[PDB]
Amino acid sequence: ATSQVLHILPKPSYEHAFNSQRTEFVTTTATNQVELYEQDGNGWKHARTFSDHDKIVTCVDWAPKSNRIVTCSQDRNAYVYEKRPDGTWKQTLVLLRLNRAATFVRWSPNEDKFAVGSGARVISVCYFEQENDWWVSKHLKRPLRSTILSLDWHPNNVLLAAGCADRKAYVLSAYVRDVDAKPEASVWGSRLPFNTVCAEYPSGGWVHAVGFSPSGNALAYAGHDSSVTIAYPSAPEQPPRALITVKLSQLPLRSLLWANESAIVAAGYNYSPILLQGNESGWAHTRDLDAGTSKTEGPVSFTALRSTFRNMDLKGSSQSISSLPTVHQNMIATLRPYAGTPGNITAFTSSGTDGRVVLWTL
Amino acid sequence: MLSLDYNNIFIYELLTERFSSENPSSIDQVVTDFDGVTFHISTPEEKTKILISLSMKCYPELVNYGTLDLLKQIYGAYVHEPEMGYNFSILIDLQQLPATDEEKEQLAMSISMLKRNVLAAPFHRAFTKQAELADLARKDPENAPMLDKQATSQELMAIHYRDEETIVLWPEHDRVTVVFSTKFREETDRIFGKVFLQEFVDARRRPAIQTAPQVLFSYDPPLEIRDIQGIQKGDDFGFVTFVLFERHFTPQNREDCISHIQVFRNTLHFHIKASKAYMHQRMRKRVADFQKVLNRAKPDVELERKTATGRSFVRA
C-alpha cells in the first residue's frame, strides 16, 4: 500500500473531513478553532479558521452532495456551516440540548440529518425544519449508559450504530418522520421507529469505533482491548449468525473503515493502518499497510551547529531523537474514504495526534 | 564555617563597641548559647556600668571542681554578686577600663570567652593533678601503677553538662582521659550522627593524624566509668573517649586544647545540620540531571523572539 503525507498541521488532529472533490479539507485542531485547508499546487494552504465554539472542538464532518460542515465541541454545541455565493461560510448554532460535551458527529447518507454523540448518556439526532428555519434535535437515550465515543450511519438513512464507553456497541433506529421515507425491511428489522434497539453487542474494552458493511448487512466495531469484532445479525429478537472477534497483538484501534464487503482497514494507538479480511465463516488480520511495522561526511548548516549545542545543553548529547518507523508519530485518530465507489474503497485518508494528514492507496 | 567559634560572638562585638564608644547607651539583653547556657547583659544602675551574668544548669557541679577559684583568677576585681536566676556575674565599669586598645580587646575577648572559662576548671584540675602524678611516677616508676589506679576513681570529674551528654575525665601520670557519654535525641540527627561518630574514630586510625589525642568509641561504657552515677549502658548513648597525652596539654597548648575539647559535640551537632544543606545541593544538582532526560521528550520547536522583559520582538 502506497502512502503520501498531504500536510503536517501545527497541532493535534482528532478529526478531518475532505469535501466531495477532495480540493479542500476541514480539521479540528485541539483548540476551540477549526482549520479549513485548500490545495496550493501539490501542497496545502490554511484558507480560514472557524472559531464560533467556546471550548475544545471534538469532531467535525463535511456533507458531500450539499457542501455543509458540521462541528461539535466540549462547549455542548454544534454549528452547521453553509457556503455563501461570495465564498464565505455562514455559521448556524444548533441547539443540541446536551447536558455535557458533544464528542462525535456524523452526517447521514442522504445529508438531511446528522447525529451527535455525547458524554450526557444520549445522542442528539439533528434535522432541519423549513417551517421554522431551525435545526432541531431528538435524543436517542433508552439503552445508552455512558459517553458515546463514535457513530456510524447504515447505508439506508435510518439506522445509527454507536460505540460506547460502557463496553457496548449499539444499533439504534434514528428514523425521523417528515425527513425519512419508510425504511425497507432489513436483517436489523422492519418495524423500525425512533430509538428502537436492533442490537446491544458486547466488547472487551470501550468501543472506540463502529462501522456498517457497505451493504449494511453486518457491523464491525473496535474495542480498547485491541480487538475488532464483526457482527452478522439474523433477525429482530434473534441472536447473530456469527459474532467474530479478531484479537490484535498491537495497541488498540481507534478508527475503522470497510474497504469492501470482505475487508476492513483499522488504525489507532498502533500508529499504523492494518488490513483485516474475512466473512461470516471467519476474519483475520491479513496485512499492515505501513511498511514501518517492520521497524525500517559533508558541509553542515548553522541550524545543525546550533541545534547540536542546544541538544548537548538541554538533553544528554548532540544526537537527535529518532522518528518512529511508522509514518504517523502518534496515535491515528480518524480513518476516512478518499477514492473509489462505495463498496470498493481504493484509497483512504487518516489524521493523527501528530498533526499529519496522510493518504493511503490499497 | 568549618569550625565553631569558642566565645560568644554577641558579647565580643557588644563589648568591643562599648569599650570604644564615646557615648554608651543603656542595654537589657538576654542572650542564649549552646548546651542550654544563657547570658544576661545589662546596665542595671548606670549606662556607665555593664553587668554580664551567666546561667548554666551544671554550675553547682563545676563549683565542686574549683570553678570559683579560676573565675576569681580570670576576672579579678570585676567579679560581682550573682544576679537573681544566674549562677555567676561580672561588673565592668566603662570609665575603669585598661589604658590600651589591645588590653581593651583582650578584656572584651576574656568576657566573651566566659562559658568556656566556667567549664575549664575540671580540665585545669585534671592537668595540674596529672603534673603531681607525673612527678611522683618520675620519683618511683614501680609505684606509679597504684597511683594511676587510685587516681582513676579518687580524682575523676563527671559533669552532667546537658541532659543528653555527660563529660567524664580523670588524670593518670602520663595523660588526661575524657569520655563524652554522647547522644542525639532527634531521629535524623541520630541516623546522620552514627555516620559522623563512626568516621570520627576511623579518621584517627589513618597516618595523617597520628599526632592527635587517641580516640576510642563504643555503644558499653569504658571500664573506668561504668559505675559513675547517670552513665547507663542500654540507654542509646555512645561513648567517645579522648586520651590526651602530655603533648596535647603542654604549657603552649593547654588553653587551646581545653577550648577545643569542650566544643567536640557542638561541632558534631553543627556538622550534622550543615550536612543536610550539602545533601540538598547534591540532590538538586541531579534533579537538574534528570531534567535533561525529560527535555528529550519535548519535540523541537523554535520560540518567537522576545525582549528581556518578555515583550515580543519584530526583527530578523
Domains and CATH numbers, chain A: 1-362 (2.130.10.10)
| Chain A residue closest in CA terms to B297 | A321
Domain membership flag for residue B312? no
Query: Nearest CA of chain A to the CA of B249: how many Å?
Result: 57
Instruction: Provide the terminal-to-terminal Cα distance of chain B, rounded to the nearest Å.
Output: 51
B112 shares its domain with B137:
no
B219 shares its domain with B77:
no
d(CA A2, CA A263): 17
| Chain A residue closest in CA terms to B300 | A307
Q: Which residues contact A7 (CB under 8 A, 6 or more apart)?
A: A37, A43, A44, A356, A357
Q: Which residues contact B145 (CB under 8 A, 6 or more apart)?
A: none
From A343, A336, A154, A362, select the one nearest A261 (Cα to Cα): A343
Query: Nearest CA of chain A to the CA of B280: how many Å?
Result: 22
In what helix (H) or strand (E) does residue A166 lie, and over which residues does it extend?
none
B96 shares its domain with B205:
no
| Chain B residue closest in CA terms to A303 | B302
The answer to whether B133 and B141 are in contact (CB under 8 A) is: no
B11 shares its domain with B147:
no
Buried b (16+ CB within 10 A) or exposed e, A81-116: beeeeeeebeebebebebeebbbbbbbbbeeebbbb
Instruction: Read off the DSSP letter of residue B299.
Output: P
Set of chain A residues whose Cβ sits within 8 Å of the Cβ of B300: 307
B177 shares its domain with B287:
yes
Chain Cα centroid distance, residue A114 = 14
Domain membership flag for residue B314? no
The answer to whether B121 and B167 are in contact (CB under 8 A) is: no
Resolution in A: 2.7
d(CA A272, CA A226): 13
Q: Is B154 near chain A, with CB under 8 Å?
A: no
Interface test with A, best of B292, B293, B303 (most A CBs within 10 A): B292
Q: Is B292 near chain A, with CB under 8 Å?
A: yes
Technique behind the model: cryo-EM
CB spacing of A316 vs B293 below 8 angstroms: yes
CA distances from B253 to B73, B118, B247, B248 (A): 19, 18, 8, 7
User: How many structural domains does chain B have?
Assistant: 2
CB spacing of B296 vs A316 below 8 angstroms: yes
Collapsing DSSP states into helix, strand and coil, what is residue B248?
Answer: helix
CB spacing of A316 vs B300 below 8 angstroms: no
Question: Given phi > 0 = left and psi -120 to 50 = alpha, else beta, which region is A332?
Answer: beta
From A330, A260, A362, select the one nearest A9 (Cα to Cα): A330
* Final residue of a structural domain among B129, B147, B170: B129
Set of chain A residues whose Cβ sits within 8 Å of the Cβ of B295: 314-315
From A305, A343, A349, select the one nearest A9 (Cα to Cα): A349
- A303 phi/psi in degrees, rounded to 5: -65, -25
B136 shares its domain with B184:
yes
Q: Is B296 near chain A, with CB under 8 Å?
A: yes
Q: What is the CATH number of the domain that holds B29?
A: 3.30.1460.20
In what helix (H) or strand (E) does residue B138 lie, and over which residues does it extend?
helix B121-139
* Final residue of a structural domain among B68, B94, B129: B129
Grid cell, residue B109, equals: 575577648
Domain membership flag for residue B315? no
B68 shares its domain with B88:
yes
To which residue does cell 595523617 refer? B208
Q: Is B22 near chain A, with CB under 8 Å?
A: no
| Chain A contact residues (CB < 8 Å to B) | 307, 314-316, 321
Query: Nearest CA of chain B to the CA of A301: how many Å?
Result: 16
Interface test with B, best of A309, A314, A317 (most B CBs within 10 A): A314
Domain membership flag for residue B316? no
B168 shares its domain with B293:
yes
Domain membership flag for residue B313? no
| Chain A residue closest in CA terms to B299 | A321
B223 shares its domain with B192:
yes
Domain membership flag for residue B95? yes
Q: Is B300 near chain A, with CB under 8 Å?
A: yes
Hey, how many other C-beta atoms are within 10 angstroms of the C-beta on A123? 30
Domain membership flag for residue B274? yes
Angle formed by the axes of helices B121-139 and B67-75, nearest 10°:
110
B80 shares its domain with B207:
no
CB spacing of A315 vs B292 below 8 angstroms: yes
Number of H helices, E strands in chain B: 10, 9
Q: Is B286 near chain A, with CB under 8 Å?
A: no
From A82, A83, A69, A76, select the one nearest A34 (Cα to Cα): A69
Dump strand ranges (E) for A182-251. 197-202, 207-212, 219-223, 227-232, 242-247
B286 shares its domain with B143:
yes
| Chain B residue closest in CA terms to A312 | B292
CB spacing of A314 vs B295 below 8 angstroms: yes
Tell me the residue range of the domain where B60 lies.
Answer: 1-129
The answer to whether B187 and B181 are in contact (CB under 8 A) is: no
Query: Nearest CA of chain B to the CA of A250: how many Å?
Result: 23
Query: Nearest CA of chain A to the CA of B307: how many Å?
Result: 20
B51 shares its domain with B136:
no
Domain membership flag for residue B147? yes
* Final residue of a structural domain among B101, B129, B157: B129
d(CA B178, CA B182): 12
CB spacing of B293 vs A307 below 8 angstroms: no
